[PDB]
Amino acid sequence: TSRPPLEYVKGVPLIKYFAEALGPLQSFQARPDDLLISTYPKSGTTWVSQILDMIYQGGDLEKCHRAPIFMRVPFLEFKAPGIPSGMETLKDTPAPRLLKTHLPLALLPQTLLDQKVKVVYVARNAKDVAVSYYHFYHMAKVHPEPGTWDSFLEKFMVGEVSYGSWYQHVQEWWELSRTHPVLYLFYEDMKENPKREIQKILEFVGHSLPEETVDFMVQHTSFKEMKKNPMTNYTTVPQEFMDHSISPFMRKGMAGDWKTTFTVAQNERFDADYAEKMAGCSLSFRSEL
Numbered sequence: 001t002s003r004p005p006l007e008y009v010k011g012v013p014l015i016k017y018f019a020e021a022l023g024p025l026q027s028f029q030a031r032p033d034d035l036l037i038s039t040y041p042k043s044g045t046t047w048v049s050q051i052l053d054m055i056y057q058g059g060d061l062e063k064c065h066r067a068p069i070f071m072r073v074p075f076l077e078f079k080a081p082g083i084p085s086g087m088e089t090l091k092d093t094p095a096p097r098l099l100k101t102h103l104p105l106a107l108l109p110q111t112l113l114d115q116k117v118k119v120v121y122v123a124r125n126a127k128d129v130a131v132s133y134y135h136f137y138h139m140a141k142v143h144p145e146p147g148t149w150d151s152f153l154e155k156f157m158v159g160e161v162s163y164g165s166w167y168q169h170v171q172e173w174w175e176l177s178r179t180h181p182v183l184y185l186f187y188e189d190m191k192e193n194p195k196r197e198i199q200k201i202l203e204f205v206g207h208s209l210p211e212e213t214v215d216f217m218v219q220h221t222s223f224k225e226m227k228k229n230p231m232t233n234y235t236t237v238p239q240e241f242m243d244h245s246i247s248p249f250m251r252k253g254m255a256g257d258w259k260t261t262f263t264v265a266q267n268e269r270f271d272a273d274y275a276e277k278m279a280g281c282s283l284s285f286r287s288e289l
C-alpha cells in the first residue's frame with residue numbers, strides 16, 4: 001500500500017493500480033478516428049501529447065489550457081488514489097480522441113488494432129530513458145522503491161521495472177508498423193529539430209496548418225514553456241501522488257545527460273548487454289546530438 005510492489009500480468013510487471021485498471025479497460029471500444037500515443041515511459045509521452053493537442057485545437061493555446069494534459073488525453077490503463085481513472089476520463093472526452101498508453105502489445109486492447117487506429121509512437125535512447133525513469137520513480141510515489149541507481153539500472157536491464165523491457169517495447173512497436181499505421185518518432189529527433197517532426201506529425205494526421213501556426217506550436221511545446229505550463233507540468237496533481245520537490249516531472253528535457261549519471265563501469269556493461277539485445281534490429285538510436 002506504501003510503494004507497493006509491481007504486479008505481473010501476462011509477463012508484464014505493472015503498477016498494481018494499473019493492472020486493476022485492465023478490468024474496466026476490457027470494455028473499451030476504439031473508434032476509427034481515435035489516435036493512440038504509444039511510448040515506453042519517459043520517452044516523450046507528454047511532449048507529443050501537447051504537440052497533438054495543439055494540432056487538434058488548430059494552434060489555439062487557450063483551448064489547450066482547458067485542462068491538464070492527463071484529462072485532455074485519456075491515459076488508457078491509468079488508475080490512482082484521488083485521480084480519475086483513464087476509463088472514467090475517457091467517457092467525457094470528445095471525438096476525435098487522443099489516447100495515451102505504455103502497454104506492451106501483449107496487453108494492448110485488441111480493439112485498437114481491429115479499428116486500425118493511427119498510432120504515434122515515440123522511442124528514446126535507453127540510457128536517457130533509464131535515468132529519467134529512475135528520477136521518475138522517486139517523485140511518482142505509486143512506483144516501488146527504486147533503490148540505488150545501480151540496482152535500478154540492473155533491474156531496468158532485465159525489464160524488471162514498471163511496464164517491463166524497454167528493449168522489447170521499442171522493437172515490438174517497430175515491427176507492428178509494418179502491418180499497422182504507425183508514425184515512429186524519436187525523442188532525439190524532436191530535440192534536434194522540433195519543427196521537422198511536428199510537420200511529420202501533421203502529414204500523418206492529415207491536417208495542414210500555416211507556418212505562423214506551426215512556428216507558434218514549436219515555441220509552446222518547448223521544454224521551457226512546458227515546464228512553465230501547469231496544464232502540462234503535472235504540478236496540479238496532489239503532492240501524495242507526484243512530489244516535484246523530490247524530482248520535477250519536467251526535469252531537464254535534454255538528450256545526452258545520461259553521462260552525468262552512468263558510471264564508466266555501468267556504461268561498458270550496459271553497452272555490451274545492449275549490443276546483444278538489439279542485434280538483428282534495424283532500429284538505430286542516437287544517445288546524444
Ligand SMILES: Nc1ncnc2c1ncn2[C@@H]1O[C@H](COP(=O)(O)O)[C@@H](OP(=O)(O)O)[C@H]1O
Nearest residue numbers: 042043044045046132222223226250251252253
Ligand atoms: N517539451 C519537452 N521537451 C523535451 N523533453 C520534454 C518535454 N516535455 C517533457 N519532456 C521530458 O520527457 C520526459 C518525460 O517523458 P514522459 O512524458 O514520456 O514521462 C522527461 O525527461 P527527463 O526526465 O529526461 O528530463 C521530461 O523532462
Ligand SMILES: Oc1ccc2ccccc2c1
Nearest residue numbers: 015041042045102140142
Ligand atoms: O506515463 C505515466 C504518466 C504518469 C504516471 C503517473 C504515475 C505512475 C506512472 C505514470 C506513467
